[PDB]
Design a protein around this ligand. Structure first.
Ligand SMILES: NC(=O)c1ccc[n+]([C@@H]2O[C@H](COP(=O)([O-])OP(=O)(O)OC[C@H]3O[C@@H](n4cnc5c(N)ncnc54)[C@H](OP(=O)(O)O)[C@@H]3O)[C@@H](O)[C@H]2O)c1
Ligand SMILES: NC(=O)c1ccc[n+]([C@@H]2O[C@H](COP(=O)([O-])OP(=O)(O)OC[C@H]3O[C@@H](n4cnc5c(N)ncnc54)[C@H](OP(=O)(O)O)[C@@H]3O)[C@@H](O)[C@H]2O)c1
Lengths: 332, 332
């Protein structure tokens, strides 16, 4: 009976389903499994369920001679060395689709919060500042940015990006996108227009990032790109922190190159930066894009389905490295 | 040349347009005009531009013998004694439409922030607590409520309510509404379904209030209605504070009768309440529904147009108390 290590307490639906087909060890602690502890525990396993926090690299593969499949509890897989996995006949799966709507909802929450000063406004009320000042209402108090009918620019036009666009249609927006290729069916269905990155940045009132982290997306939103954005524009990052040059973003926010930003993801996590966190025109969330009951349950069910399919000699439904099919047939 | 007092520093477009046709006094101070000061200044005026903060009642009318028209810098007019105005031949105008998109955007900002813990999350990051606890990401961290595909119940289905529904369509929602009359064109255009209030409250995952304050809407969201709502539901109030029984809402939030609330408006303003302000599951904004430059500019242009139309012997374009037309012809 094959052994699986699950590196965090995922929802019980997934754990229980895996227990029917695997011997299951779960890392029970809130904190990330320590690196030395991971390398010790993988020695014996046939499968892994990993979080974005575990770096599944050559060193891990060398420590886990029986390892045949890694199911990421995440749609991103920048934490896994995919090419090295393929070379070794190791299957890698992810969790697309089940978290699309949670992440797109969160991107929209950030867009609107940053646009209309929701965080600063809440503190203004909650701290008693509103009351202490004695002024109920003023025609110039807390003026923010219109969203309805404006232009949204979506960087990355896959599952999450297109979901962000569906919501934008409810807001009557002009929709621009960039991607590695045109998406002509999505253009027709969503009314979206393909643009080079730099033209998108120049024309957009709202820029939302929904790309994977790759060599090519690393620091794509740098100083030069931030300078192209409108001074009234709002930037939202629900992708990966390293897509943005944080030092450049801090200058942009402080000096008024852009109006505001909503950030769910950071170059190091958990993140603290005194300079960024002092700014009224940033809205911050602790990497909670996929944090709904429904999404996290669906993720758990999907990691389980992938490992069970593999055990049954089937191609896992959300296999990422399809080239591995030529290296080794599925199964333990 | 007729005299107008404008009780707040509204956008210059409106003030300047009025200066072409009226002798204009503007109350330019940060604080609202004191009651005793208002009663002194109205003695001499032919017209007023008022904010929601000024109570235009029998006492004001008795102090202002030349007063023929009051233009509220607001779509709401619960601060004006309309029946007494009509009896005296005084025309009352408001600012519909020009602020609809700002207010509906803000309602959506509140809905999403309350649903996904944006305010609480921001403080968790900004304070350094996220970093100090040392955990980047966890499958159970900050789980919130799915919005896409859920049911929204919109209480009041006029200009702002229908705008809230247009946005909901981008979120693929089932749309319920209640109002004093059925809206068959809106049903066809928006896919919205009419329900009695109590069925709407039972069936909705998100309830948004967009009614005026009247004798009938006063405390309509009371203990009984909050108990009918789902324990997972989110309530958003962009209407008037007095539509909700705040004491009952506090019990509902604390005891889990509903999940969360987003509030832009309160029974007293500015508002202070230690019990409500202690709650993680409320999101607060300081009555900033119409707070975009474009909304506020349009409001200013519209108050000016109303007073100028009246001066010209025309029916003002956003006259509220149309029965006054039988009492006195327009003009000074
Ligand atoms: N904040 C969170 O909690 C959270 C949650 C889930 C996901 N995420 C992040 O969101 C990412 C996207 O997920 P998804 O399901 O939408 O993935 P996806 O369907 O693969 O979409 C990614 C899109 O990015 C585009 N892209 C890739 N490299 C690009 C480049 N260099 N320039 C421009 N566009 C580029 C792709 O273009 P092509 O289609 O032309 O190849 C694709 O359209 C994940 O990889 C993850 O890092 C974050
Ligand atoms: N938070 C802010 O900054 C902000 C900004 C602007 C406005 N507001 C508030 O929002 C209100 C609505 O503005 P609007 O332009 O949408 O007005 P509206 O177009 O007159 O719409 C009001 C809707 O409420 C309905 N209604 C009235 N009494 C009701 C009751 N007892 N039960 C159920 N529905 C009832 C009306 O029914 P019928 O259609 O049958 O008449 C109508 O559908 C304003 O009056 C103001 O108080 C707040």
């Amino acid at each position: 009976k094959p052994k699986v290590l699950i590196t965090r307490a995922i929802p019980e639906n997934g754990i229980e389903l895996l227990r029917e087909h695997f011997e299951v060890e779960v890392w029970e602690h809130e904190h990330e499994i320590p690196r030395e502890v991971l390398l010790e525990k993988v020695k014996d396993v046939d499968a892994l369920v990993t979080m974005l926090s575990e770096k599944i690299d050559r060193e891990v593969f060398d420590a886990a001679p029986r390892l045949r499949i890694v199911a990421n509890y995440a749609v991103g897989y920048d934490n896994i060395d995919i090419e090295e996995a393929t070379k070794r006949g190791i299957y890698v799966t992810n969790t697309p689709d089940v978290l699309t709507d949670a992440t797109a909802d969160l991107a929209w929450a950030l867009l609107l919060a940053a646009a209309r000063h929701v965080v600063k406004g809440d503190k203004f009320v909650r701290s008693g500042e509103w009351k202490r000042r004695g002024i109920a209402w003023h025609p110039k108090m807390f003026l923010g940015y219109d969203v309805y009918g404006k232009t949204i620019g979506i960087v990355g036009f896959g599952r999450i990006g297109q979901a962000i666009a569906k919501r934008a249609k409810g807001f009557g927006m002009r929709i621009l996108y960039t991607a590695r290729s045109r998406k002509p069916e999505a253009e027709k269905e969503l009314g979206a227009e393909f643009k080079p990155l730099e033209e998108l940045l120049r024309e957009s009132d709202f820029v939302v990032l929904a790309v994977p982290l790759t060599k090519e997306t690393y620091h794509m939103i740098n100083e030069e790109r931030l300078r192209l954005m409108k001074p009234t524009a709002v930037l939202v990052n629900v992708a990966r922190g390293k897509v943005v040059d944080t030092k450049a973003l801090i200058r942009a926010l402080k000096e008024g190159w852009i109006a505001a930003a909503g950030l769910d993801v950071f170059e190091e996590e958990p993140y603290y930066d005194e300079e960024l966190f002092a700014l009224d025109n940033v809205v911050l969330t602790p990497h909670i894009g996929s944090a709904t009951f429904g999404a996290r349950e669906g993720m758990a069910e999907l990691v389980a389905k992938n490992l069970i399919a593999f055990k049954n000699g089937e191609v896992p439904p959300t296999l990422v490295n399809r080239e591995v099919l030529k290296v080794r047939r599925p199964g333990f």
